[PDB]
Structures are given as structure tokens and as C-alpha cells.
Amino acid sequence: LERVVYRPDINQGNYLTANDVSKIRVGMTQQQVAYALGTPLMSDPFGTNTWFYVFRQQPGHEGVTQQTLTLTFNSSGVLTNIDNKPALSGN
Amino acid sequence: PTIASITFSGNKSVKDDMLKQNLEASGVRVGESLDRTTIADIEKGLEDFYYSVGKYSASVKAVVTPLPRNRVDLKLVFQEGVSAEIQQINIVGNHAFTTDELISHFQLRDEVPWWNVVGDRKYQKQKLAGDLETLRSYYLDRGYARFNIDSTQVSLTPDKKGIYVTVNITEGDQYKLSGVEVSGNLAGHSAEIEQLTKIEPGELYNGTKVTKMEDDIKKLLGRYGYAYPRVQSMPEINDADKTVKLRVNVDAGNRFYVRKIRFEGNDTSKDAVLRREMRQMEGAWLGSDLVDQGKERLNRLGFFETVDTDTQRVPGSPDQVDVVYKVKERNTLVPRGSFNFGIGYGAESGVSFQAGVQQDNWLGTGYAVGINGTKNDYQTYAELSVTNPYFTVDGVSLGGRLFYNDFQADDADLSDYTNKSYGTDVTLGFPINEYNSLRAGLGYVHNSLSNMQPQVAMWRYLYSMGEHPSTSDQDNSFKTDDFTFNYGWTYNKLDRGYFPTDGSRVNLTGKVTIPGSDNEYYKVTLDTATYVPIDDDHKWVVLGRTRWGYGDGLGGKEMPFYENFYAGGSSTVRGFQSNTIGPKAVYFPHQASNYDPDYDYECATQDGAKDLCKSDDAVGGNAMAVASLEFITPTPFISDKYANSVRTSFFWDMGTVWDTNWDSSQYSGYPDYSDPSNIRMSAGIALQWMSPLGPLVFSYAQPFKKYDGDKAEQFQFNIGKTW
Amino acid sequence: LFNSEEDVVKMSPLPTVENQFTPTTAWSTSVGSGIGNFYSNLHPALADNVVYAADRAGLVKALNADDGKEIWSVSLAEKDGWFSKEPALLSGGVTVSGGHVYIGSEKAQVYALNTSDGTVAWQTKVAGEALSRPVVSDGLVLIHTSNGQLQALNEADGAVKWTVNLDMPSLSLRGESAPTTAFGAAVVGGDNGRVSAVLMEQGQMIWQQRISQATGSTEIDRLSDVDTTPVVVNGVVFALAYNGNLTALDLRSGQIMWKRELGSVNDFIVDGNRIYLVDQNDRVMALTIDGGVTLWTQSDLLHRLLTSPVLYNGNLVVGDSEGYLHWINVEDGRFVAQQKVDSSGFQTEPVAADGKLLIQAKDGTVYSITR
Amino acid sequence: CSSDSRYKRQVSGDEAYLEAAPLAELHAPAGMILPVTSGDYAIPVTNGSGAVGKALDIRPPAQPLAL
Amino acid sequence: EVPDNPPNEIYATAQQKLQDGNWRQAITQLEALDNRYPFGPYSQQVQLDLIYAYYKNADLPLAQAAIDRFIRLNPTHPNIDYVMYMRGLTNMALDDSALQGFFGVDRSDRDPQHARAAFSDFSKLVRGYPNSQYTTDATKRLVFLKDRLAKYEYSVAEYYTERGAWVAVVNRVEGMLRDYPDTQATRDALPLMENAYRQMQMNAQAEKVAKIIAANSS
């Protein structure tokens, strides 16, 4: 299964450079979030006005690295929810 | 009235179709409403078109006849005298150069040099504008930052055929690039942008250099994911210092994300075979280099005649983009890749056939399959190959091939014997880099031999193998069980996967017998092809190709002859019978134990000589070296580079095969195969056409350097090879 | 491969051979390498028995008119400096007055050469190549350029005195028209159908009676009209149009005195009342200044690429690009004589002065003719 | 050209649409809202009486004529 | 090919040839009739006959071009329903290319552009002209074509699952739910989004999609 082979350095999800992470504040509306972090590439489809920001890489075939940044809004688009995490390991 | 037909005559092939377009612009058309008077009035518009195309001398006439109830048949007749010959290209105000240097870079010409008569000095206004821009780009490249093209003039003579063109220009002075300033939101990538900006302040200003600076800034911003940044370059100029400070203004914009990867035009190639060639992943920040590598991989795979890339901003969304790969499939719905009809044809008065299918469309499990059944010389050889280039999407390929082979020796340079061979190979291949592939494989072969006419080269192997056969007997039998560690190595980087233009391919194949195998030997093969765009323009190409091979016995058994190398086929060395090249099969004298009086079999002693004997037969060689240098050009025809992408080449081939174990000392009385300097050569013309059936190949190449017994054929034809 | 169907429109065959008088060459000399497949106004000149001639390479020759004895010769070609040697690429006629010889060039330079000496007096840069024959007027040299700009140069030192722009289209035929001066003003023609007059001082515009009558819907039909040297008498201007309308104009104002349907015309010479004119269809006709009425017309040399016509020894005389020379009767309107003098090319116009008739071939050789 | 002179209506390929295409619906569990159908790719109500392609005629209608 | 016979005779013989199934000569004859007599009232009928002949003669690009031409000439016409059905059928037929796919392999994940355009055209037909006789077969083709599009999306989702571009898998399955909610393809796809959401450690979202699959297992 696990072997040395040129797995083509998959990138996944948005980019969460630390500066743009620090840009976010709880008082924002969806427009400010979109401006600061870019459009959410994973909008929550199942009812809740939740935006998921995922920053995932797997350089080569070793050391999966990911950040998950979860945002939620009221029906008006006003934000009050933040979860910020480094992901668990993979290969 | 209405017109049953509109016809054009006298046209010297000058855009006949546009004549109908001119009428359409004039408001007339087949069956359209026009009368005789307006026809004469509109014919002036045809004169207008031929004036626009450069045929200023042209004038047009109309001929018409009504059908008995006012339905019209129309002919249009043209006068199209010589015109638009540029008798001069003049540049005035120039003081930095001799004009001849400037005009020589134009597409237009004043006097076509007899040294190389290319094209003709015929005027075309759009090309005049293009050449004006080339002149400006030359002056800015040389460094005259203030250069200006002022009121270009075009003149024709009181006899209209004579044209000459004048350009007034102003120069100022060439300016130093005293410094460069870059400003804007670079998103922290300033350090690398500066490395792009790096210049010695003593450097002379250069328009092309600043343009490439903008290009490379765009490139770097694209790699990190800024698809469409605003990039501006603006000069800051002082004429008293005669130097230019340079300003670059950049807005990195948004990090663009690829919402969709869309493949279009592949009506039969399953989407997976395109998508797994992607380096840029969907739902990830864009990488311009990643998308370009995806395009390059699609081209390299060779499945697709054309590959085009478009990046589209998602409608109404600020930063998301769709990436669209538009392709045209090879073989255009002819089933099973390129149908490999393999042929033996040329100057040789002999016939050979191969039949096979290739590539993509195969059933049930996503594999790619190749089949081949052949008779070559008097051999019978069949094989089945089953392959999956992606055994798992990580990139590791898996491949297994089965084959059966038979030998009968009714001349065709096939040495007198009867032999049967069959075997299998199981293969794995996993890329180690984007441009490297490494392979491992296990192979199994069994052989049985009979009617063994005695033969020194083969008998060297048989004698050393043990169970040494009895000389002078026409019949001897031998058997072999074989297991082999098949292995290989590859480097592949090519524009397209066919008719390449740039890059190189290196393919190394080698096998070694694992103990328990009877043969106890190893052999190595190297294949190499290199391409170069002439003048760094890929429309004009030159190909360098070489093959190398060696094989020796680990336990002193040298190599079994039935895995010896060969050359002579159009794939390896044009201009020879497929396997005639190299060492020739010297027989022993023998007493025809098994024989047929209907055959003049080589050197059967009851009829032939009673000593060691030459013949046209070839045993190949346990070593090989082959080289080819090729020159590629267009050749217009109703089917051409644009309509069908046909290729034609001028080339030279160098080929040589030698046996490392020929007893040069003991056998001084016969040709000494031990030295490779017995080089064969051939050179000439080759043609290739991607017919819907598959790649046809045509070539005439006289074997102008030759050795004893090489069965020449200055011309050769075949179809397929697929790769 | 493809050569079987090249297309060319034919010229009329040579006229009748019989001649009332037999012309003969007095002398001929090679000025230098010829114009070749090249088209610019460049013709010999005469003043006080000394011939002046030149050609594209830059060679200039001064010769006696009774016989071809050279007075002096000089080459205006650039010093090579071991790089690509540059020929003068000479063009724009030859003119003489007092102590100087004025020559244009296909490049920016206009050269002033001494008559008694080969010495270069001065050379000045002008806006665009001086394809036009320079003219002398009241201490100045007036020049018209391929770029449509007219320059006046101080004859004493060659310095530019003024510049005047004449508009031209992107496809302006041959950008050539030699101005003329009389009554204290200088007439000029511009490629954009603009016959105009200038004060010949401070570059002051007088009037611009532009000929819009071309009305060319297609660009070639809208080919630049005027390229000819206008002439003046009694304060009346006469001008020509390659595609448009011949017209006679007031010189005080620009208003029309007469206008004619004649296009396809590039050269003419004037008798006291009869215009003698050459069509680019190579039709030759005599027209009254008043009313534009025809004394005589013939077209036997149709499409022969005629030279400009000149009046010499009581005959109208004109050449052609084929190599033949023809005399036409002044008022009978028929060939007086016909001759062949060259095999290569005879395009540039003849000059008649001081009792001589001079011509320069398309292939670099001058001839002195008499009849 | 060679053929049996029939199938004047069908495509050269598989007319599988005639069968094996039931539009199985999807149902939302309580407490979750599924994403909206988003426009064009909904199929409206249909009469259901018209014939299907194995018998239905695809020749152009008999338009009236004049000249 | 065909001389200047009267338009009526040409049309009658061309109709006969259509009934004889002489598709090539039929196409030539109607093309000649159109070229010589495009002005007369026969043009529209000739246009429809050309449309049908191009489609059946397997000249699909020319059939589509003729359909476009007819629609441009006739924004309103008693047969527009038939011509729109013909456009849909032409773009549908452009997919099923040859025999080897017929017996060999499924052809659902090669290219949706032809299928998607055909589906849009059939949608126009069914929505605008429901009472037309062609509605029902158009509806069946719409159902099959939508299923085929959903299977293409599923065949992309499966690839991205194998490679592991989990964000791509989630996005693709969400798009399928948005566009093709009522198909077997998406019903089979959701068990794959359930894995994709969990691979990214997004437990609650995976739980919600698991809730959906629990009910829709029916």
C-alpha cells in the first residue's frame, strides 16, 4: 500500500494564510468574510447558513496537513460562530 | 430576378470563395434578387476586393443569360494582371543603423536574395502594420526608448503594378535602465518579484526585457494563484540624463479558486483518462503552472490531436474560475486507438504482415490493450498485451503480456533452423518524478529448438551452454526454461505525444535471468529521442535519435541468440531489410541429415562447401548502436500541416551491430564481427500521415554506406507503430 | 508548377514607321548605374551649354552640350567605414541656377552642388524624402516630399525657412509634385487632391481649391489625384489629376476658371493657348486652355507608359517605357517621326532647352537628340 | 452504404432511453433542508399519452404548400 | 447533380426518395431545390425536409445548422415544436457514436456538452409546448438524459474520491444534489460524500449526510 511514488502534491480547499485568518472578527457580515478570505469553497448545503473554510495539503505522499476554519451566520448573514483547528495526521 | 447560378472565371486561384462573400456584402447571392444593371454596378465591388488584396490592376466583367421566364444564370469574369510588387522599402530619418539591417527583418522585401530565394516581394497592408510594429520593437529592444514611427507612407506607380513603401522614424538616443521600481499589493511576494526585476543599472533599456518582466510577474502571481492580476509597466524618463527609470504597478487581486474542471470534445475517451493527468486539483487554489502541466500531460499522453486551455471567471462570482480543457481525439472515432496494420514493403521483393489494435477503448475494467499477430520473414509471432497505465490513481501502472513465437527458415535472411518460443511478462511502472518513470517486471520464457543447422555464432552459445551439439549434423535439439527480472527506466518530456517539437524521450529496458533460469545472462537496452525547435519556433523541428544495447552472460554463458538485437526496420534504421544488418550467419559444413532437395539450403555439404560458410542470413548481435539525425519540414497540399498535420522529414541514419564474442583471432579467414566500426548508413526522405486508420509511414533512403550481405532496400513503407 | 497562366495587360504595338524627318542621336554617355526597376523623378538639366545629370547610385555628371565632354563628376555615396556601404539612393530631379546644382534624394538629404565645380556646397535634412524636383525662386529652394510636407530652404546656406503640410492618404500614388512660382506666389499640389498656392514667404497659405470631384468610393478609385508640375500664365493656374478632373484655376483666388473630365493624367506642357497632355492610358491630346476643347487627340501608344511631353523643334515629342521615341505634329495631331534609342527603359521625362533635347534612360545612359 | 433499409427513425447508437430510466425521488429527513433544485434541470409535468420513439414518427409534419 | 426541373417535380421526387430511404440522393435533391428556389413558399417545407434528412443521414452538424437556420427564419411557425424536438434529438444522437460502445461499454462519462445542450433544448420544448404530440417522448428522453448527466457527475466524484481531493468530492456531490437531486446517480453518490466529509474530520456534516442516506436508503 504505502510506497515511495510521485503522488502529485494535491492541494485542496481555500488558502488560510495567517494574516487573513487574523483579519476575521465576530462583528462581520458575509460580505466582509468574503472580502477577507475569498469566497467559501465549501458552503454548507444542508439548511444552516454555515461557511466552511478548509485549507488542506499533502506534499508528496507523506504528512497530510490541514486547517479547518468553520463560520456560521444568521439568516441575515451576520456572523457569530468561529472554530479554528489544525487537523489530525494522515499518512 | 432570381439567379439559378453565379459563377466566377479567370481567377488565378486568388480567394475564389471571398468573391461570393463580396457579393453577399453587395446584397446578392445564388437565387437572390438582382438585375442586369445592378449586376454591372456591383461588379465594381469585385474590383474593390481585388484592389484590397493587392491586385490593383484588376478589373472585373459580368456575363449573364436569362432563362425563358426571367430566371437568370450569371458568370463573372476577372482581369487580374500582375500587381503589388514592392520595388522598394524605404526608411527615412534613421540615423542609428543602416536601413538594410532594418528592412531585412520585415516580412516584406525589396529584393529577394538569390542566396536563399524564400517567398516573394508581394505587398500586404496588414503585414506592413505588423512589420511596423517589428521595427518599433527592434528600436525599443536596441534601447531607443523615445523611438517613434511617424506617418508611414505607401505609394504605387502611375503604372499600378509598382509599389514602394516609406516609413519616417525618429530616434532620440538609446537610454540606460537607470533603475526599476515595483509598487502595489504584492501579497508578500516582493522578494521574488525583485529577483525578476534584478538588473545591472548600466544595462541599456529594452522594451522586450520589460515586456518579459511583466510576463514573468504575471507568471509568478499565477503560480501562487493570482489568475488575473493588474500588471502595469510605465517608464520614467529624463532626456538630459538619457536614462529611463522604470515603474511597475501591480494589483495581485484575489486568489482564484478552480470551482470546475471541465473537459470538452472527448466524445469517446473516458473522462478519467483526462482527469488523472491533471496536476491542478479541483476545489483548490489555482496554479497557472499546474494548469499548464495538465495541458502538457494531456499533450504528452498522445490521445488528443489538439489541447486548448481556457480559464473562465465564474459568472457573477468574484474569484472562482472554471478551467476548460478542449481537445480533439486521435483517430476521430475509428475504433480501438490506431489500427496497427503492420507491413513489410519497400524495394525488397518480400512480404510480411502484422495486425494489431491499440490504446484506449477496451471493455469492462478501464485497461488499455494491445494485440499483435505477425509473420515476419518465415517466422510466426503472436502476442497479447494487457495494460492499465493507472493500476491505482497514484500513478503506478501495471502491465502483463503473453506471446507465442515460431521459427521457419526459408531464407529471408533467416538462418536455417526450426525453433519455437513462448513466454510472458508481468510489469509494474511507477513515476518517480513528473518527468520520470521507473519499471520492474518478472518474465517467463520457454524455448524448444530442432532442425538445428550447425552455425558458429549460435553454437557458441549452445557449446558453452552444455549439451554441446554434434557438428556436421543438420539436426540437433535443445530446450530452455527461463525466468527473468524484467526492469526498465524512462524519462519522458515532449510537446504532443506524436510528431514532437521539443523535449526528449529516454527509454531504458533491461532484463537479467534469476538463477534457476537456464540462460544465466543479462542485457541492457537504451532508447533516446530528442527534439529541438529550429530558431526556437516549434513549427520547424530537428530530431536526434539513438539506440544502444549490450548483453553478456553472468555465468559465462554469454547470451542466447534468440534475444539478440537487430536493426533495419523503418523504426530503427531506414533503408534495409528488417533484420539483415549486422553479423552474418556463418554455417558449418553438414551432411543434410534432415533436408529437402527442392531447397538450395545454405551450405549443405552434399551440395555446398565442406568448410565454414557465409550467407545472407543475419544472427543479429549481442551489442548494438544506432543513431539518427532528422530534419522536419512542411509540404503543402490539399491535405497539409493545417488540414491534416502531415509530417515529412529529411534524415540521416547511422546503424551498426557487432558481436562481442566473435573469435577475431581464431577466425581470421572470415569477416571480423568484433569491431563496431563497420558502420552502415542511409539517408533520404520520410513521410508520415495520420490517416483515420492510423499513422502511415513512407520513406526513401538509399543505404549509401554498406557491408557484405546487407540486403538493401532504398525505399520502405509501413503503417502504425503508434509510438 | 504554376507558371502557365501569369496575367498582364497589353500595350498597343508600335505606331507607323514612316517619318517626315529622320531624328538622330547627337551623343550619348553613361552617367552611371541606371534607375532600374525603380520609379522616381530624375532627369537631366541644362543651363548655358553645360549638362547636369545624375542617377540613383549618387553619381553626378556635368557635361558639355555640343558634345559629351565631361566638366566634372562626383559621387554622393556615403563612406563605408568598412560597414555596409550606403548609396545616395538619389531621386528628385536636377535643377541649376547661378552657382549651384540642386538634387534631392530618396532619403532625407537634399544636396547642393556647384556648377563650375564638383564641390558640395551644402546638404540639409527635410521631412521625408524629396521625391519631387526642387525648384528655385527668389533666393530659396522649394521642395515637396513623399511625406506630403513642403519645405523652403535658404538658397545661400540651405537652412529651412518654413514648412507647410499637405495632407496625403495612406495610399497616395507617387508622393511627388513640383511647385512653381509666379506673380509672387508658389503653386503646389498635394496627394490628397489639394492644388494650392503659398506666399513663397513665411510659409503663408493663400488658397486651397481642393479637388473633391474624384468621389472614389473604393480606395484605388480614390487614388491620390494630383502629382504634376502645375504651370501659370496670365495669373491662371493649370493642374492635373491622376484620377479626378483637370482644372484651370485663378491664381489670385483659388476659384475655378475651367474644369474637365480628364483623369489618368500626370504630365503636360503649355502653348500660348494649347495644352499638350499625356494620359496614363498614354492617350495624347491637345486641349485649349479656354473651355477645355480638343484640337486633336490620338491614342496609338495606349498603355505604353509615356514620358512627359515637351515641345521641341516645332514638334511635340514624347518617349515610352518600351524604348522608343516619337514626334507628334503640333496641330495636325499625327506622328511626325518615330525612333528607337534604348532597349532597357526610358521612363523619366525629356527636357528641352538651349536648343537641345536631352533624355535619361531607365538604365543609366543619357542621350542628346536632334531632328 | 449497406443496411437493412429500415430504422428510418432511430439513431445508429443505443436507444436505451425507452427503458431503465425511472426518476427515483429524494426525500428530506426531518430537521435538515436539502439544497434547492436550481432552475433548468427540473422536468415539468407531461401528458403521458404521446407515443414513444419505437413507434412514434419523427418525419416533419405535412405543412401546407403554395407557389 | 440535379438539373433545373420545376420545383414541384423536384419536391415530389425528393419526397418519394425520402420514402424510399435514399437519404444521400434525397439530401442532394432537397439541397438543389433550396439553392435554386429558396425564395418561394416551398422554402419552409424544404427546410423541414432537409432537417429530417440531415438527422437521419447521420449528418448531425449539418442537421443542427439547418435547425438553427429554420429557427432564425421562423421564430413562430406551426411546426416549431417539431424542429425543437429535432434539435434535441440531434444533440442527443451526437453522443451514441458507434457499435463498440453499444456492445462493449457504458458511454455515460465521455462528454456532457452534447447531452447537456440536448437536455436544455428538450426542456425548452416540454416547457413551452406541453400540448405538442412530441412532449411525452421528449419527457422520457429528458429523464434519461438527466440520469446520464448525473452519472457523469458521479463518475467525476468517484475519481476525486480515489485520488482523495475530498473538497472536490464534497463540492461535486453538493452540485449534483443542487441540480440532479431526484436521480439514482446522486442516491448512490451521497454514500460517497459521507466518506468525503469524514476524511476531512468534519464530523457533524458527515453525520447530517448520514442522516440523509439513512432515510433515502429506501
Grid coordinates given for B680: 552502415
Decide: helix, strand or coil at residue C79: coil
Which candidate, C214, E84, A50, E11, places its Cα nearest to that of E2? Answer: E11
User: Treating both helix axes as pointing N-terminal to C-terminal, what angle do E80-93 and E135-163 enclose, rounded to 10 degrees?
Assistant: 30
- Pairing state of beta strands B176-185 and B243-251? parallel
Nearest to C195 by CA among C240, C253, C163: C240
Collect all residues of chain C within an 8 Å Cβ-Cβ radius of residue B168: 127-128, 147
Touch between chain A and chain E (3+ CB pairs, < 8 Å)? yes
User: If 0-12 CB within 10 Å is exposed, 13-18 middle and 19+ buried, where does residue B202 land?
Assistant: exposed
Q: Work out the number of other CB atoms within 10 angstroms of the CB of residue C136.
A: 16
- DSSP letter assigned to residue B652: E
The distance in angstroms from the start CA to the end CA of chain B is 60
The C-alpha cell that represents B489 in the structure block: 527506466
Taking a C-beta distance cutoff of 8 angstroms, is the pair E167, A42 a contact?
Answer: yes
- DSSP type of residue E72: H
CATH code, A10-85: 3.30.1450.10
Q: How far apart are CA B89 and CA B614, in angstroms?
A: 69
Do B622 and B564 form a contact (C-beta atoms < 8 A)?
yes
* CB contact burial C18-45 (16+ within 10 A = b; e otherwise): eeeeebeeebebebbebbeebbbbbbbb
Contact (Cβ atoms closer than 8 angstroms) between residue B719 and residue B693? yes
A80 min Cα distance to partner chain B (Å): 24
A56–E163 CB contact, under 8 Å? no
Q: Is B269 left (phi over 0), alpha (psi -120 to 50) or beta?
A: beta
Q: Show the 3-state SS of B151-219.
A: EEEEEECCCCCEEEEEEEEECCCCCEEEEEEEEEECCCCHHHHHHHHCCCCCCECCHHHHHHHHHHHHH
The set of cell numbers assigned to B557 is: 554463458
Per DSSP bridges, beta strands B85-92 and B162-170 are parallel
Could you tell me which chain D residue has the CA closest to the CA of A45? D35
Contact C178, C187 (CB under 8 A): no
- Whole-number Å distance between alpha carbons of A11 and A20: 18
Phi/psi for B360 (5° steps) reads -100, -60
In 10 A of CB E165, how many CB atoms?
27
Integer CA distances (angstroms), E61 to B635, E64, E120, in order: 30, 5, 18
- State the CB neighbour count (10 A cutoff) for residue A67: 19
**Rg of chain E over CA atoms, in angstroms?**
23
Please report the DSSP string for B580-640 in residue order.
T-SSB-PBPPB--SS--TTS--TTBTTTS-SS-B--S-B--BSEEEEEEEEEEE---SSS-
Tell me, rounded to whole angstroms, the distance of Cα B386 from its chain centroid: 26
| Residues in chain A after which the backbone breaks (C–N beyond 2.5 Å) | none
Q: What is the dihedral of CA E14, E16, E20, E26, to 10 degrees?
A: 0
Question: Is B282 within 8 Å of E35 when comparing Cβ atoms?
Answer: no
Instruction: State whether residue D26 is helix, strand or coil.
Output: coil
Integer Cα distance of C99 and C95 in angstroms: 11
Q: What is the DSSP letter of C283?
A: -
- How would you classify residue B336: left for phi > 0, otherwise alpha for psi between -120 and 50, otherwise beta? left
Residue C295 burial (10 A CB sphere; 0-12, 13-18, 19+): middle
SS3 content of chain D, % helix, strand, coil (to 5): 10, 0, 90
Task: Report the sign of the C-alpha dihedral through residues B583, B588, B589, B592, in that order.
Answer: negative
**Amino acid at site B27:** G
Touching status, chains A and B (3+ beta-carbon pairs under 8 Å): yes
How far apart CA B509 and CA B489 sit, in angstroms, is 6
Q: Which residues of D11-48 are buried (b: 16+ CB within 10 A; e: fewer)?
A: bebbbebeeebeeeebeebeeeebbeeeeebebeebee
- What whole-number distance in Å separates Cα of residue C126 and Cα of residue C122? 13
**How far apart, in whole angstroms, are the C-alpha atoms of residue B39 and residue D60?**
38
- How close D43 comes to chain A (CA, Å)? 22
- State the number of CA atoms in the 13 A half-sphere of A38 facing the CB: 28
CA distance B450 to B464: 18
Q: Which three cell numbers stand for residue B574?
A: 531506414
Judge whether B615 and B415 are in contact, CB under 8 Å: yes
Identity of the residue numbered E183 = T
Answer whether E190 touches A (CB < 8 Å). Answer: no
Give the whole-angstrom CA distance, residue D55 versus residue D57.
6
Question: Which amino acid, one-letter code, is at A39?
Answer: T
User: Which cell numbers in the block locate residue B66?
Assistant: 436569362
User: What cell numbers appear for C296 in the block?
Assistant: 486633336
Beta bridge partners of C353: C356
Helix axes E7-20, E42-56, angle to 10 degrees: 30
CB–CB contact A52 E205 (8 Å):
yes
Distance separating the N- and C-terminal Cα atoms of chain D: 36
Neighboring chain E residues of A42 at a CB cutoff of 8 Å? 167, 170-171
Residues of chain E contacting B33 with CB distance shorter than 8 Å: 39
The set of residues, in sequence order, having a beta carbon less than 8 Å from that of B491 and lying 6+ positions away, is B435, B436, B437, B504, B505, B506, B507
| CB atoms closer than 10 angstroms to residue C205 | 10
Resolution (A): 4.0
B79 near C CB under 8 A? yes
b/e burial code for range B383-414 (CB count within 10 A of at least 16 → b): bbbbbbbbbebbbbbbbbbebebebbbebbbb
* Longest CA span, chain C: 63
CA distance C360 to C351: 9
* CA atoms of B3 and B249, how far apart (whole Å): 61
Where in chain E are the domains? 1-218
Q: Which residues contact C191 (CB under 8 A, 6 or more apart)?
A: C148, C166, C167, C168, C169, C172, C173, C175, C177, C224, C225, C226, C227
Neighbouring C-beta atoms of residue B264, cutoff 10 Å: 15
Residue E71 has which C-alpha cell?
429557427
Q: Environment class of residue E172 by beta-carbon count within 10 Å: exposed (0-12), middle (13-18) or buried (19+)?
A: buried
Contact between chains at E97 and B333 (C-beta distance less than 8 A): yes
Chain C: give the shortest CA distance to residue B166, in Å: 8
Q: What is the SS3 assignment for E101-158?
A: HHHCCCCCCCCHHHHHHHHHHHHHHHHHCCCCCCHHHHHHHHHHHHHHHHHHHHHHHH
Rg (CA), chain C: 20
| Unique residue bearing C-alpha cell 539518427 | B628
Task: For chain B, state the CA radius of gyration.
Answer: 34
Sequence-distant (6+) residues with CB within 8 A of B438 are B429, B430, B431, B432, B488, B489, B490
**CA-wise closest residue to D22 among E140, E112, E179:** E140
- Nearest-angstrom CA–CA distance, D41 and D52: 21
**Residue B22 · residue B45 · CB < 8 Å:** yes
CA distance B217 to B211: 10
Nearest chain D residue to A43 by CA distance is D35
Q: Report yes or no: B327 and B304 within 8 Å, Cβ to Cβ.
A: yes
List the single residue in E with minimal CA-CA distance to D10. Answer: E56
- Check A42 against E171: CB less than 8 A apart: yes
Chains D and C touch each other (3 or more Cβ pairs < 8 A):
no
- The answer to whether the CB of E150 falls within 8 A of the CB of E144 is no
Query: Edge to edge, what strands does the sheet with C160-165 contain?
Result: C135-137, C140-144, C149-154, C160-165
Give the integer Cα–Cα distance in Å for B217 and A66: 29
Structural domains in chain B, CATH included, are 2-79 (3.10.20.310), 85-170 (3.10.20.310), 176-251 (3.10.20.310), 257-329 (3.10.20.310), 395-443+482-719 (2.40.160.50)
Q: Are B588 and B613 in contact (CB under 8 A)?
A: yes
In SS3 terms, chain A reads as CCCCCCCCCEEEECCCCHHHHHHCCCCCEHHHHHHHHCCCCEECCCCCCEEEEEEEEECCCCCCEEEEEEEEECCCCEEEEEEEEECCCCC
Give the mutation candidate from B256, B285, B322, B492 for the A interface (greatest A CB count, under 10 A): B285
B579-599 per-residue burial string, b: 16 or more CB within 10 A, e: under 16: bbbbbbbbbbbbebeebeeee
DSSP one-letter string for B284-345: BB--HHHHHHHHHHHHHH--EEEEEEEEEEPTT-SSEEEEEEEEEETTTT-SSSS-EEEEEE
Residues of D with CB under 8 A from a CB of A: 32-35
- Taking alpha carbons only, the member of C211, C183, C194 closest to residue C150 is C194
Experimental technique used?
A: cryo-EM
SS3 of B67-124: ECCCEEEEEEEEECCCCCEEEEEEEECCCCCCHHHHHHCCCCCCCCCCCCCCCCCECC
Write the CB contacts of E64 (distance below 8 Å, at least 6 apart in sequence). Answer: E87, E90, E91
Q: Which chains are adjacent to chain D, needing at least 3 Cβ pairs under 8 Å? A: A, E
- Best mutation target among D38, D52, D58 (most E Cβ atoms within 10 Å) is D58
Which residues in chain A are contacts of E200 at CB distance < 8 A? Answer: 54, 56, 66, 68, 87
Question: Is residue C368 a contact partner of residue C360, using CB atoms and an 8 Å limit?
Answer: no
Site of grid cell 414518427: D57
Q: How far is CA B266 from CA B14, B293, C132, E111, in A?
A: 37, 19, 65, 6
What's the maximum distance between 2 C-alpha atoms anywhere in chain B?
103
Cα distance between residue A83 and residue A68, in whole Å: 8
Reduce the DSSP state of residue B393 to 3 states and report it: coil
Can you spell out the DSSP letters for C223-277? Answer: -----S--EEETTEEEE--SSS--EEEESSS--EEEE----SEEEEEE-SSEEEE
Q: Which residues contact B715 (CB under 8 A, 6 or more apart)?
A: B346, B347, B699, B700, B701
- Give the DSSP H or E segment for D16: none
CB-based contact C368:C358 (threshold 8 Å) = yes
Residue with C-alpha cell 483623369? C263
Q: Which of E42, E97, E100, E197 to mutate to test the interface with B (most CBs of B within 10 A)?
A: E100
User: Which residues, other chains included, contact E157 with Cβ-Cβ below 8 Å and sequence gap of 6+?
Assistant: E169, E172, E173, E176, E189, E192, E193
Q: Which residue of D has its CA nearest to E181?
A: D26
Chain C touching partners, 3 or more CB pairs below 8 A:
B
Q: Is D48 helix (H, G, I), strand (E, B) or coil?
A: coil
Instruction: Give the three-class secondary structure for B511.
Output: strand
B57 touches chain C (CB under 8 A): yes
C58-63: long-range contacts, CB 8 A cutoff, minimum separation 24 = C58/C87, C58/C88, C58/C89, C58/C90, C59/C31, C59/C32, C59/C33, C60/C101, C60/C103, C60/C113, C60/C118, C61/C29, C61/C31, C61/C32, C62/C101, C62/C115, C62/C118, C63/C29, C63/C366
C-alpha–C-alpha distance, residues C231 and C309, integer Å: 14
Q: How far is it, in rounded angstroms, from Cα A83 to Cα B188?
A: 26
Cα–Cα distance for residue pair B577/B697, rounded to 1 Å: 16
Decide: A69 and A55 in contact? Cβ < 8 Å: yes
B60 neighbors B77 (Cβ within 8 angstroms): yes
Mutate to test the interface with A, among E180, E200, E203 (most CBs of A within 10 A): E200
User: How many residues in chain E?
Assistant: 218
CATH superfamily entry for domain E1-218: Tetratricopeptide repeat domain (1.25.40.10)
